[model samples]
Target: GMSADGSEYGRYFEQLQKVNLTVRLGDTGSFDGTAAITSLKGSLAWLELFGAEQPPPNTLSEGAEVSVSVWTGGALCRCDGRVETLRDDRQFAIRLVGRVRELQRREYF
Candidate 1:
């Protein structure tokens, strides 16, 4: 998270930071996005997991809402949520809806 100038945690990826809005089938916090990452920021320490009851992602058939567990970086920073790719089921990335934390937090603050 350091700047190229070697300055203390400078805002390097400011342009890359953004507010991410995505839907995941499970945990893992992996996700694409509905838009781009404008106002750059820091990583998300938490996330909100949800399951679409009636219609899942890219689902042609209707379904019911299935309950899953909510996870955060403290307990949700794992690839387990992403089951790679199966034959019958589809895989998805994990994501979260959180504020952009401190971009630069290092020495010489």
Candidate 2:
């Protein structure tokens, strides 16, 4: 028998733990909150929102599209994905639907 434990994303769960992040739910800018990366494996990512940063009720659910942004190596990395699991109000998981990309500051304006 052979063991396979490598992630296709080239990054491991340990490397992404505790990474600060922000997430926006849906296509519009209606809901936004701050969270931290709790785990990562392949295209799946778990996030835990800050104690004071909870979103409105019924705003998040399985399959809801979301956009995530995180600061890494002096750049802002962004990715579009969908909510995969909703453990509770403060914890949830997302499945990355696109590759992460660095955002240019000028792109925001």
Candidate 3:
């Protein structure tokens, strides 16, 4: 069995970088919060965002779409995915459902 610490997954949780998040639930207002790119698996990924206080519970229940933008490895990437799990107001899991668009790339840091 794989290790609980996920040695095989390169310990992605330990390498997460802080990011800005803007989430919108359809016609609702935009939800701006502090988020981090916790994990990335091919086209799948996960993020946790802390709302102004906390989300309205089960924010991931409306088949809502999400957009995540981050900079890493000399490149800026944006991922569009669907909400998978709403662990709480501050924790969420996203499954990439659309193409990952590259925002910008630099030759060297």
Pick by TM-score: which candidate is best?
Answer: 2
Give me candidate 1's TM-score against the actual structure: 0.18
Q: Which regions of candidate 3 deviate over 4 angstroms?
A: 1-15, 50-53, 57-62, 104-109
How many collisions per candidate?
Answer: 7, 0, 0
Error of 1 at 78 (Å): 14
Model 3 accuracy (lDDT, Cα): 0.55
Per-residue lDDT tens digits for candidate 2, residues 1-109, read 2322233433322334443334554444556666777677667777877668677777677777777766545565666777788888778877766676665333453
Q: Rate the local accuracy (lDDT) of all candidates.
A: 0.25, 0.63, 0.55
Per-residue lDDT for 70 in model 1?
A: 22
The TM-scores of all predictions, comma-separated, are 0.18, 0.70, 0.59
Per-candidate Cα RMSD to the true structure, in Å, reads 14.6, 4.6, 5.7
Worst 10 residues of 2 by lDDT: 1-10
